Amino acid sequence: SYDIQAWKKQCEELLNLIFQCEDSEPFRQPVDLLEYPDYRDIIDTPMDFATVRETLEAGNYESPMELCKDVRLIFSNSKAYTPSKRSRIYSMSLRLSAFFEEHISSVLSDYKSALRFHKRNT
Numbered sequence: 001s002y003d004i005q006a007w008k009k010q011c012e013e014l015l016n017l018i019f020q021c022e023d024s025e026p027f028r029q030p031v032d033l034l035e036y037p038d039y040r041d042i043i044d045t046p047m048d049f050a051t052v053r054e055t056l057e058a059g060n061y062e063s064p065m066e067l068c069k070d071v072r073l074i075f076s077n078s079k080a081y082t083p084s085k086r087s088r089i090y091s092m093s094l095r096l097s098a099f100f101e102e103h104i105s106s107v108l109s110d111y112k113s114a115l116r117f118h119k120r121n122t
């Protein structure tokens with residue numbers, strides 16, 4: 001399965017599944033800076049799933065590793081901002097992260113395998 005480009009549509013489909021998850025609600029759009037007035041004191045680099053989808057559609061990811069780094073930033077930001085581990089929004093982040101990790105692993109493995117096949121004789 002050595003298609004170097006296949007990751008992009010696989011990531012579009014996984015983003016569609018994440019948008020169908022009720023657990024993505026808080027992460028779809030930027031953290032509301034009016035409601036959380038201290039957010040940018042705590043979080044240096046905001047990230048959300050709409051920004052990830054637009055960056056993919058613009059052709060501004062070169063690999064699924066770069067997409068994965070941005071999605072993992074959504075989850076680390078939630079963990080850094082939460083006042084407690086039993087918070088609703090952080091709790092949603094942990095379930096959504098587990099879902100994401102379960103489905104991104106084959107996308108990353110197939111991409112890295114395809115690149116190694118491309119260089120097999122170099």
Ligand SMILES: O=C(NNC(=O)N1CCN(C(=O)c2ccco2)CC1)[C@@H]1Cc2ccccc2CN1Cc1ccccc1
Pocket residue numbers: 025026027028029030031032035036077078079081082083087089090
């Ligand atoms: O909620 C939102 N965005 N993000 C945050 O405000 N968050 C709070 C902070 N945070 C944390 O990680 C965290 C950890 C512990 C505590 O917070 C990330 C999440 C946005 C805001 C917004 C503004 C203007 C119009 C619409 C919306 C939609 N909203 C959600 C939504 C999405 C789809 C449908 C219904 C509602």
